[PDB]
Design a protein around this ligand. Structure first.
Ligand SMILES: *[C@@H]1O[C@H](CO)[C@@H](O[C@@H]2O[C@H](CO)[C@@H](O[C@@H]3O[C@H](CO)[C@@H](O)[C@H](O[C@H]4O[C@H](CO)[C@@H](O)[C@H](O)[C@@H]4O[C@H]4O[C@H](CO)[C@@H](O)[C@H](O)[C@@H]4O)[C@@H]3O)[C@H](O)[C@H]2NC(C)=O)[C@H](O)[C@H]1NC(C)=O
Ligand SMILES: *[C@@H]1O[C@H](CO)[C@@H](O)[C@H](O)[C@H]1NC(C)=O
Ligand SMILES: *[C@@H]1O[C@H](CO)[C@@H](O)[C@H](O)[C@H]1NC(C)=O
Ligand SMILES: *[C@@H]1O[C@H](CO)[C@@H](O)[C@H](O)[C@H]1NC(C)=O
Ligand SMILES: *[C@@H]1O[C@H](CO)[C@@H](O)[C@H](O)[C@H]1NC(C)=O
Ligand SMILES: *[C@@H]1O[C@H](CO)[C@@H](O)[C@H](O)[C@H]1NC(C)=O
Ligand SMILES: *[C@@H]1O[C@H](CO)[C@@H](O)[C@H](O)[C@H]1NC(C)=O
Ligand SMILES: *[C@@H]1O[C@H](CO)[C@@H](O)[C@H](O)[C@H]1NC(C)=O
Ligand SMILES: *[C@@H]1O[C@H](CO)[C@@H](O)[C@H](O)[C@H]1NC(C)=O
Ligand SMILES: *[C@@H]1O[C@H](CO)[C@@H](O)[C@H](O)[C@H]1NC(C)=O
Ligand SMILES: *[C@@H]1O[C@H](CO)[C@@H](O)[C@H](O)[C@H]1NC(C)=O
Lengths: 97, 129, 364, 125, 124
């Protein structure tokens, strides 16, 4: 489990990486299995989370395989671990305020 | 049907000859018998398909015989001998009375009462062996 | 001691390059009907659907190879048809250079025509001639056929427009239900109608309303909530909802009605929690759109002068769940365009017949 | 051209495997019939050339012409050795084809060499 | 059976015998006429390539070895037919150079090679 430290209110880049570099479908969930982000083809789709207006991803990097998550306005109650499901590899990354 | 359609006509060359002189020349003949304007082009293509819907029909009619010879042992052999004993109940004639004074057409008027039974006996004799 | 055979009825499940077959016209300058004369043969005049006798085959829907063969050609269809004036594909080498481009861009016509996907020499297509086929598992009555039915490449999110409808009850199919990351392709048994008109009062230009009947929509979604409790519990209180967010193309039911990309608003269409007139969709023609073919934005010409309308046949519902208990939140989804055609190519499979087995008999 | 007949039983296949060859105005659309007249005839030359390219494999393994041929390569135990009784009783030829996945590629590799061993055996007497 | 089937005429006959056994708008409303007409040319070439294979399986059948690639027979060589040392004509010689050598006797080999099967047809 990787852990990323962001102080308060900044923007982090919880990275996640594929292999074949062709923008396959991914997602980002949490401990209660609630969707943060979501790729849908060539578009982007959020989910009913606490980061509903706080989540975004770099769109130009999807073709290279990197599928990061960038959270802005880092509050105190977002400390959890996040599940990036590229093909099957749920690479967990934990977050601390 | 220029490819293997002229082969089937060449089989009937020595009809009415005697049975010995017609079976002797099978090997000889088969080596020798196997030897655009605007309105035009949408009609001259159907003259190219219909000349291939019969030329291919000469192929898959010829290969429906080698699939039949291959079941009874020998495939590719014209003259071929088999391990099945000739019952005298088909015809009660000596071989002196057969390969000397008969033509091949008279066999279809003589053993076609039994010619589906022989094809079953030629099946198992090269199935278990 | 093995025994080779050469008569066995054994077919693999292979992948090949199919060829399109569309009922083209060759004089019309509709931009679908000029591609369908260029890369499609006409319809097979003598089509034959032989029904296989008593074979059951384990299909799969989500790993098909026709739905990534189809996606290669409607990507290739929307590059000749709708050439935008300004297109920004993010070429990269953070240093991603947004490579602009420019070309001619005249206004054109646009309607989906049915397209059959045939099979080449030596291959077959195994239709799943059933009624309750849930996408994965053994189809019981698998017939065979050379070409598929008339499939029209209508690209839309949140609502599978103009597609074929189930003769049995409302089907629900997902790759793994209770995953909360896979879409749930509902398919209607009756065609819900929808009008989508841009009006003629020239004042706004880019503003339209869409009317769906209140009698049909409350009854059709009344069928969906029943069979959603089939794969779920019997007393779950499911909650329909607005779409969450993201881009405009997946938050809102987007399509293309005669060359102009509509962007509707289905918040009044999913506004009911289920237990135990005419809705008006405020739409908007957009002009700076994202592309579904690849990553990158594209800009088009302003809309045309006259009245723009297209009455339709919504026959699909690409919902999406979220994982708290005793309820379910079902907000709409769609946008990955492979789901827009595997909703219509689910009962097909391409095989090839391999007649050479080596059975055990232990002969000598 | 040699297709199958519905499968549906392994044992009843081998009885009917033999009999598949043991006995036997428009003028308006001249592109609907000319294009589909070639595609229905390109699928009849391929059904001939796949037969000749598969009598070429059975010609390598000495099995040329015979539908049900028998050969002298013994069963390894590592090729999914199931019950030899119920294989012919209640099974289709599709279900048996799943029962060997990648052993088909190495079953064929012995038959090419066992004939070449038999080529070095019949000419060594 | 094909026509572009052996364009692998390399150098070593010993290696050649090894691989002897292993074997968008251009339309202008006329691109369905280019693919239909030249579809026939790819069918008149493939069907004739079948009927050349069947014409030769009867010729290998007269020599007894039908349906098989490497036919080993029961007739020896001679001195008139380029009596080399079986190293210069099997490891460093292309088939085209070998075919150009014995071309004077290919019609002479085929006569006796038929007779060598008819003698093996006498003991039956
Ligand atoms: C689901 O399927 C249905 C069934 O096909 C689809 O509904 C059809 O949709 C198309 C377009 O949306 C529509 O076609 C129009 O029909 C009109 C007559 O009914 C035509 O007049 C009109 O042609 C004009 O509009 C085109 C738009 O680009 C122009 O390119 C064309 O040259 C014509 O333009 C003239 O008129 C306009 C004013 O309208 C003016 O500005 C121009 O200068 C010029 O004078 C279209 O062909 C069909 O009628 C619809 N079918 C039905 C039964 O209503 C539906 O679209 C499908 N769903 C989806 C999502 O695609
Ligand atoms: C259907 O399956 C049964 C199984 O007992 C079999 O006997 C029957 O032959 C099958 N039907 C056909 C048409 O083969
Ligand atoms: C479907 O998703 C659930 C939830 O993660 C999981 O337990 C199950 O194994 C999945 N099914 C398959 C076939 O993987
Ligand atoms: C849509 O419905 C509203 C209210 O029922 C009505 O005023 C309007 O005229 C309708 N528009 C069309 C195009 O039917
Ligand atoms: C759609 O419009 C057509 C004609 O304008 C009308 O016949 C039909 O009833 C309308 N449907 C709905 C649901 O408004
Ligand atoms: C109409 O919708 C309400 C909820 O909005 C639902 O309770 C009711 O059952 C629906 N009507 C019918 C006839 O099903
Ligand atoms: C639709 O989404 C918007 C923003 O996400 C929200 O303001 C609105 O309330 C939603 N509609 C419904 C019916 O919840
Ligand atoms: C239209 O969408 C807006 C947000 O995009 C939302 O607030 C509103 O409720 C929607 N209204 C309808 C009728 O869909
Ligand atoms: C839609 O939902 C809102 C709040 O969720 C409610 O006030 C409104 O009456 C609903 N509209 C309909 C037509 O049910
Ligand atoms: C919508 O579906 C109905 C089926 O009842 C059909 O009659 C109608 O023509 C369809 N409309 C289209 C395809 O535009
Ligand atoms: C071609 O010639 C080179 C040099 O003699 C040799 O190394 C190579 O193997 C040859 N390749 C073929 C295909 O004959």
């Amino acid at each position: 489990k990787k852990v990323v430290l962001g102080k308060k209110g900044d923007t982090v880049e919880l990275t996640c990486t594929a292999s074949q570099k062709k923008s396959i479908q991914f997602h980002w969930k949490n401990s209660n299995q609630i969707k943060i982000l979501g790729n849908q083809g060539s578009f982007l789709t959020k989910g009913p989370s606490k980061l509903n207006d706080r989540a975004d991803s770099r769109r130009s990097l999807w073709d290279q395989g990197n599928f990061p998550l960038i959270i802005k306005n880092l509050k105190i109650e977002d400390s959890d671990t996040y599940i990036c499901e590229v093909e099957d590899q749920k690479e967990e990354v934990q977050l601390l305020v | 049907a220029v490819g293997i359609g002229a082969v089937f006509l060449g089989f009937l060359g020595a009809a009415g000859s005697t049975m010995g002189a017609a079976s002797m020349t099978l090997t000889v003949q088969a080596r020798n018998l196997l030897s655009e304007a605007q309105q035009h082009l949408l009609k001259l293509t159907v003259w190219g398909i219909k000349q291939l819907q019969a030329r291919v029909l000469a192929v898959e009619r010829y290969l429906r015989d080698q699939q039949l010879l291959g079941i009874w042992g020998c495939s590719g052999k014209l003259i071929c001998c088999t391990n099945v004993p000739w019952n005298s109940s088909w015809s009660n004639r000596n071989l002196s009375e057969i390969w000397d004074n008969m033509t091949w057409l008279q066999w279809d008027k003589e053993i076609s009462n039994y010619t589906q039974i022989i094809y079953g006996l030629l099946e198992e004799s090269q199935n278990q062996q | 001691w093995v025994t080779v055979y050469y008569g066995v009825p054994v077919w693999k499940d292979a992948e090949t390059t199919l060829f399109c077959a569309s009922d083209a016209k060759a004089y019309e300058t509709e931009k679908h009907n000029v591609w369908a004369t260029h890369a499609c043969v006409p319809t097979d005049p003598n089509p034959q659907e032989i029904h296989l006798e008593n074979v059951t085959e384990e299909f799969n829907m989500w790993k098909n190879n026709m739905v990534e063969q189809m996606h290669t050609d409607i990507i290739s269809l929307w590059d000749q048809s709708l050439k935008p004036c300004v297109k920004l594909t993010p070429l990269c080498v953070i240093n991603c250079n947004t490579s602009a481009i420019t070309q001619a861009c005249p206004k054109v016509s646009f309607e989906p025509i049915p397209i059959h996907y045939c099979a080449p020499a030596g291959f077959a297509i195994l239709k799943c001639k059933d009624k309750k086929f849930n996408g994965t598992g053994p189809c019981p009555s698998v017939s065979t056929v050379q070409c598929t039915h008339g499939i029209k490449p209508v690209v839309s999110t949140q609502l599978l427009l103009n597609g074929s409808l189930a003769e049995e009850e409302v089907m629900i199919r997902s790759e793994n239900i209770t995953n909360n990351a896979k879409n749930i392709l509902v398919q209607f048994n009756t065609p819900v109608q929808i009008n989508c008109t841009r009006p003629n009062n020239n004042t706004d230009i880019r503003q339209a309303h869409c009317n769906v009947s209140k009698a049909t929509w409350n009854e059709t979604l009344g069928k969906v909530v029943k069979q959603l409790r089939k794969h779920f519990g019997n007393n779950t209180i499911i909650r329909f909802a607005n779409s969450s967010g993201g881009d405009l193309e997946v938050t809102t039911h987007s399509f293309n009605c005669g060359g102009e990309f509509f962007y509707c608003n289905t918040s009044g269409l999913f506004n009911s929690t289920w237990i135990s007139d005419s809705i008006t969709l405020p739409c908007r023609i957009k002009q700076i759109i994202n592309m579904w073919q690849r990553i990158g934005q594209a800009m088009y010409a302003p809309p045309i002068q006259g009245v723009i309308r297209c009455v339709s046949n919504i026959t699909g519902l690409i919902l999406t769940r979220d994982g708290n208990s005793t309820t379910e939140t079902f907000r709409p989804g769609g946008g990955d365009m492979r789901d827009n055609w595997r909703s219509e190519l689910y009962k097909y499979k391409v095989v090839k017949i391999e007649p050479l087995g080596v059975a055990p008999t232990r002969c000598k």
